[PDB]
């Protein structure tokens, strides 16, 4: 170990996801997020060594100036082991900013879990290693606030969460605005799409879209989803009147075509 000099005004620390020792689903990218904007992306990428077993090709793509992702062309094979070596200690990351430390993490890929929300049927079907294990009636975004189509990575889960329109700049007093207590909420986009419990739309689930974009399901089905679907599992939304989830959403990585992803943006 060679000492590197530092200043708290010219350091950036990397934060790696997923967590060390975690089992994640087949859609989980490696994520390295810095606590500062990175001017020299090529330097960051050169300092990050990702090894896979069985080996699979993958590549870096920056979602923004703070966060780089690495993934293969297709969903991970279940059982793959992934080692992430972020060797940034003392690395010049541009504009006088230096890497503060090294970070080192390992994780493994679990079962293939893919839930398809089909707007033509209003059914969310959960498949594990190809086989249907659950079918849930759902109510997605109304035509004026539709659910975007595309591949969503499952993120964090909450037994309870508050949906407050003011975090989107829409006052709760507005026609228009809302402040809703929600149970059993699984996040699937940074923009704010969740699968969650919605007793108020149970009669519409399987029939009519009534939400602001979220995937409304029954309390029991939302708890099932909370219990059985893990970070990195996949939700694919198809056949809505919405567009496509942005590839740089935070959980929309798989919507970027592979040739653009692999070419990168460093």
């Amino acid at each position: 170990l060679t000492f590197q000099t530092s200043s708290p005004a010219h350091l950036t620390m990397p934060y790696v996801m997923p967590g060390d020792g975690e089992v994640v689903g087949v859609g989980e990218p490696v994520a390295i997020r810095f606590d500062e904007n990175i001017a020299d992306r090529g330097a960051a990428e050169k300092a990050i060594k990702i090894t896979t077993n069985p080996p699979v090709e993958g590549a870096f793509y920056w979602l923004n100036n703070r966060e780089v992702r690495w993934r293969p062309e297709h969903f991970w094979k279940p059982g793959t082991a992934v080692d992430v070596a972020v060797n940034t200690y003392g690395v010049d990351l541009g504009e006088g900013m230096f890497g503060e430390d090294n970070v080192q993490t390992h994780f493994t890929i679990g079962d293939e879990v893919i839930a398809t929300a089909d707007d033509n049927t209003k059914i969310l079907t959960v498949r594990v290693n190809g086989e249907v294990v659950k079918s849930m009636p759902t109510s997605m975004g109304k035509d004026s606030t539709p659910t975007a189509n595309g591949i969503y990575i499952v993120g964090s889960r909450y037994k309870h969460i508050i949906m407050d329109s003011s975090t989107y700049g829409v006052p709760v007093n507005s026609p228009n605005g809302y402040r809703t207590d929600v149970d059993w909420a699984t996040q699937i986009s940074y923009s704010g799409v969740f699968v969650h419990s919605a007793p108020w739309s149970v009669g519409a689930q399987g029939h009519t879209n009534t939400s602001h974009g979220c995937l409304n399901v029954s309390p029991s089905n939302a708890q099932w989803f909370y219990d059985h679907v893990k970070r990195g599992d996949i939700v694919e939304v198809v056949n809505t009147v919405g567009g496509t989830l942005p590839g740089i959403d935070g959980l929309g990585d798989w919507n970027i075509p592979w040739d653009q992803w692999r070419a990168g943006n460093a």
Side-chain angles (χ1 to χ4, degrees):
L1 173 80
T2 290
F3 172 72
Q4 314 287 322
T5 186
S6 65
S7 163
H10 296 101
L11 288 166
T12 183
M13 179 73 78
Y15 292 87
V16 180
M17 286 284 268
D20 195 31
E22 291 281 358
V23 177
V24 300
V26 300
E28 185 77 4
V30 179
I32 305 99
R33 180 178 179 84
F34 294 85
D35 59 5
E36 303 278 345
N37 291 309
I38 299 307
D40 193 343
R41 295 178 173 184
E45 292 183 11
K46 180 186 176 182
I48 298 164
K49 309 295 291 294
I50 289 150
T51 43
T52 56
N53 190 8
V56 62
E57 169 184 76
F60 292 112
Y61 193 87
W62 292 77
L63 304 188
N64 54 48
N65 293 329
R66 309 264 318 270
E67 184 166 346
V68 70
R69 301 279 180 89
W70 191 103
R71 64 170 172 86
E73 172 175 10
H74 300 295
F75 295 152
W76 297 101
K77 179 181 165 203
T80 300
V82 184
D83 184 72
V84 186
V86 184
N87 299 321
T88 39
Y89 179 58
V91 171
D92 192 338
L93 296 167
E95 300 172 350
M97 186 103 340
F98 291 83
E100 187 166 355
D101 204 352
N102 300 319
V103 174
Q104 197 64 341
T105 88
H106 183 100
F107 64 92
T108 71
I109 307 302
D111 289 311
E112 180 202 59
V113 181
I114 300 173
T116 298
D118 192 342
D119 199 33
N120 283 346
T121 65
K122 310 271 193 292
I123 301 288
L124 175 65
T125 302
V126 185
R127 291 176 178 87
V128 175
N129 298 318
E131 295 230 3
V132 176
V133 303
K134 198 84 180 85
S135 294
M136 313 178 166
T138 190
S139 181
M140 297 192 277
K142 55 198 183 295
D143 277 13
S144 54
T145 61
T147 304
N149 297 292
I151 301 167
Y152 296 72
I153 305 160
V154 169
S156 298
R157 58 179 190 167
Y158 300 88
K159 286 187 194 175
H160 198 74
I161 192 162
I162 301 162
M163 315 296 201
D164 188 313
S165 61
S166 61
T167 63
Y168 297 82
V170 175
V172 294
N173 269 116
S174 81
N176 193 12
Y178 57 80
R179 200 269 185 203
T180 308
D181 291 282
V182 161
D183 300 323
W184 307 120
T186 295
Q187 189 166 10
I188 64 174
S189 74
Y190 283 23
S191 64
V193 180
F194 288 78
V195 178
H196 67 81
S197 169
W200 48 89
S201 62
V202 290
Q205 290 158 19
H207 301 288
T208 301
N209 288 337
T210 63
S211 83
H212 299 276
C214 286
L215 278 62
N216 287 184
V217 297
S218 72
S220 56
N221 280 333
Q223 185 173 2
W224 189 96
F225 206 93
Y226 175 98
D227 284 337
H228 288 89
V229 179
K230 78 170 50 71
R231 166 178 312 276
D233 290 346
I234 289 295
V235 175
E236 180 168 14
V237 177
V238 295
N239 292 316
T240 76
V241 300
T244 302
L245 182 72
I248 59 165
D249 162 89
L251 294 165
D253 307 38
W254 297 97
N255 300 291
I256 301 179
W258 177 241
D259 56 355
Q260 302 178 20
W261 185 280
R262 188 180 179 188
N265 52 2

